[PDB]
Amino acid sequence: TSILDIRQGPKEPFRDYVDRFYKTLRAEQASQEVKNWMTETLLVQNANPDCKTILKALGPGATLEEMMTACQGVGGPGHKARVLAEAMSQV
Amino acid sequence: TSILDIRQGPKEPFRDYVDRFYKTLRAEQASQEVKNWMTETLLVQNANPDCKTILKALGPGATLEEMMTACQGVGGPGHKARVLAEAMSQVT
Amino acid sequence: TSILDIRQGPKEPFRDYVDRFYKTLRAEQASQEVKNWMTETLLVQNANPDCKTILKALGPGATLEEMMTACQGVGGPGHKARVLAEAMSQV
Amino acid sequence: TSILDIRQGPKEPFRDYVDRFYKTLRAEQASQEVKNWMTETLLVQNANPDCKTILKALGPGATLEEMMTACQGVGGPGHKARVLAEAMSQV
């Protein structure tokens, strides 16, 4: 089990995935500075395309509490229809 | 386990999220006065965007009996379909 | 587990919700006359909007066998298609 | 547990509903003659609306293996598409 193998499933909630990332990062023998750097590059990189498109729109300086509120809609009745009703228009 | 970590899943029913919120609130090293203030602030802010839009429409003064009866359709056949319809009308 | 705390989930079938309602009602500490009054009022009130809209059409006098026969379509293919078409043709 | 309570869920496959009916039927206290009359009346009556409109179109005489083959499509990814298409053309 290595921190680099943790990826968000295609239908996994972002809350459930952020917990596995931290659950794993508590075992990987490394320095605190490294673990913080890990948290700053892998977390948003290894997210699924749905959450990734939303986390990029926020930009830098966003904390967990700011992402974890912007992604708890992914997979809800509002999202699936907002996206679905767009691909119809886009094509 | 902290009360601030309890969020409503994107597909979780509101009834289940309210249970965890209160299930987690009754074991917090907080005062009774604080736990009431927590209930009023955290409960509605940590709901997913589907329940929130519905709750934010009721306004202040709504009890759990009024909120939960208004959200138990979220994710159901009627609610899902209605949303999709208004998604084709707003964009066409 | 109070009796007033039993509600019908959004995706939960009616058969399953009624089972929990009675499972919990049998454990309540109260009199028989009260328990029957509970069933008459709470059972249809704590139901989700879909089963509720179909129950308010049967009206009063419907039995626990007429209701369940009227709601076991909720959440099925025939139901979902019927609910979706009616909404699309409205806007 | 009584044979008259067994009902097909709104999303339950038809194979898994016939399995519980007979699992329950073999336990009900009655004679074989009464159990054969239960099967002809209850089994089809307690089916959900989707697995019922199909059976009502075979008519009498169709055995179990004749029905189960007619109902194993309900809920498949080709059944919904068919039901959903007629609903639109009806409004």
Next chain:
Amino acid sequence: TSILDIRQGPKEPFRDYVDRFYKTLRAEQASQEVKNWMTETLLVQNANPDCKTILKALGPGATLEEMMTACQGVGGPGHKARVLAEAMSQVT
């Protein structure tokens, strides 16, 4: 249980259904010859309509490796959408 009662669920994958079929066939009390005749007739008849439509297009002489590879798309995003289209176009 008896091999004649093994059917493919409406939402079950073909891969998962061929395992119970063979798992059951290895338990059915018959001769090894009657078992090959079972596999050649029942395995396809007891499949759900979605997979059956794909299998009856290939024809005779197709091996499990060819069938299983042709049905592991049933129930997927591309497959679902592909069926919902021909119906909509060949209807409304």
Next chain:
Amino acid sequence: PTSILDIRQGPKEPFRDYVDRFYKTLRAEQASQEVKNWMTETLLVQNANPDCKTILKALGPGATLEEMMTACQGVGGPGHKARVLAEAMSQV
């Protein structure tokens, strides 16, 4: 026993999950390490379901694991389905 040749991706299974089973199974196969590398290049990309295969077929040769898996973790998601469903109706 399980043969590496029978590990196929379910019609509704995440690529991450199917990859893990492939490697969990390949670690046990009694082949030689030279035969296992050849297995990884042929079977893994061949025994995938049609939804992931069409995308891997686009990456082309020279694609590492970290590149494939990042390309497939969207399959089965809202953005994916809506995009695949939108072209089906457009192609017909």
